């Protein structure tokens, strides 16, 4: 009739068999969840990087 209710016994042994891996961090994390007003302005800044290229290469040279 009655049986065991709950245990975390042997759970930690199972977790560490394949390791508890930290999430794979890498360059260029995603922009999900960032402020929409800030985000749509950065798109305008990226779009208009074309102009001022002549000034950039003049300064770099």
């Amino acid at each position: 009739a009655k049986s065991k209710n709950h245990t975390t016994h042997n759970q930690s042994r199972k977790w560490h068999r394949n390791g508890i891996k930290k999430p794979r961090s890498q360059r260029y994390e995603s922009l999900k969840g960032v402020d929409p007003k800030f985000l749509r302005n950065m798109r305008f800044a990226k779009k208009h990087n074309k102009k001022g290229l002549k000034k950039m290469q003049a300064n770099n040279a």
Binding site: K14, K21, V34
Partner: protein
């Protein structure tokens, strides 16, 4: 059997320290948080808006977003056999700058200065931290005074 309430078991966790109740000091609202800096999540209970969940109290994360009153923090959370990066919105009353990153950033600037000076002067200097080495050989003077004899004291029932 345990309830699933969002603030179960936070009776002392979100309570204010002794004789530190009342108005929140204003410099906590004047801290500048940018994208990429490391912040400890505390979770004070005077402000009930933007409270982090109790599983993030004491955790440290990295800011990825800044709003008018809060920040978005990427903070690791361990769920059974996996760790996954949560993103939480926390008002600035419940965070503070982590000094571990400040200490390391200080040591980087000192290291780059030390390399710069050593190259321009003509020296090589150890920049890595080394673990505490075994003690060096030394002489201990008695100064003409014999060491004091120590003996265990007799037992007696104190009180």
């Amino acid at each position: 059997t345990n309830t699933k309430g969002k603030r179960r078991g936070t009776r002392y966790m979100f309570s204010r320290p002794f004789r530190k109740h009342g108005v929140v000091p204003l410099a906590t609202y004047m801290r500048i948080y940018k994208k990429g800096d490391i912040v400890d999540i505390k979770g004070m209970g005077t402000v009930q808006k933007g409270m982090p969940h109790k599983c993030y109290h004491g955790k440290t994360g990295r800011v990825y977003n800044v709003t008018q009153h809060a920040v978005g923090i990427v903070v690791n959370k361990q769920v059974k056999g996996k760790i996954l990066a949560k993103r939480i919105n926390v008002r600035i009353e419940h965070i503070k700058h982590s000094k571990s990153r400040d200490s390391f950033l200080k040591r980087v600037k000192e290291n780059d200065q030390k390399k710069k000076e050593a190259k321009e002067k003509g020296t090589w200097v150890q920049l890595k931290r080394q673990p505490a080495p075994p003690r060096e050989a030394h002489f201990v003077r008695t100064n003409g005074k014999e060491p004091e004899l120590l003996e265990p004291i007799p037992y007696e029932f104190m009180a």
